[PDB]
């Protein structure tokens, strides 16, 4: 169907494990959900403009390869996430 099964690379797995359960494979939906929770728990967003995330000083910044991004940049977020996993 439309569901996507994935296997996160080492660093993304570390990211995911800090807020969720360890699994051999995850769905893209699960990954997106956990990343949101990770960003929230670490308060990486701007309190006064919460659709803006600054990740340069965080593991997420190392994974995505950018200092910051807007939650509205869907293509960017999806492509950056795909660059950190393998589709099964």
């Amino acid at each position: 169907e439309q569901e996507t099964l994935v296997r996160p690379k080492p660093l993304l797995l570390k990211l995911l494990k800090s807020v969720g359960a360890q699994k051999d494979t995850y769905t893209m939906k699960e990954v997106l959900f956990y990343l949101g929770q990770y960003i929230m728990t670490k308060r990486l967003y701007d309190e006064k403009q919460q659709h803006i995330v600054y990740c340069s000083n965080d593991l997420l910044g190392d994974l995505f390869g950018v200092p910051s991004f807007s939650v509205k940049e869907h293509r960017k977020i999806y492509t950056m996430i795909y660059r950190n996993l393998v589709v099964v």
């Binding site: 949101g36 929230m40 919460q50 659709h51 939650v71 509205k72 869907h74």
Partner: peptide, 9 residues
């Protein structure tokens, strides 16, 4: 409201 925006992905 971060979640409101994140829900859009």
């Amino acid at each position: 409201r971060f979640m409101d925006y994140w829900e859009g992905l």
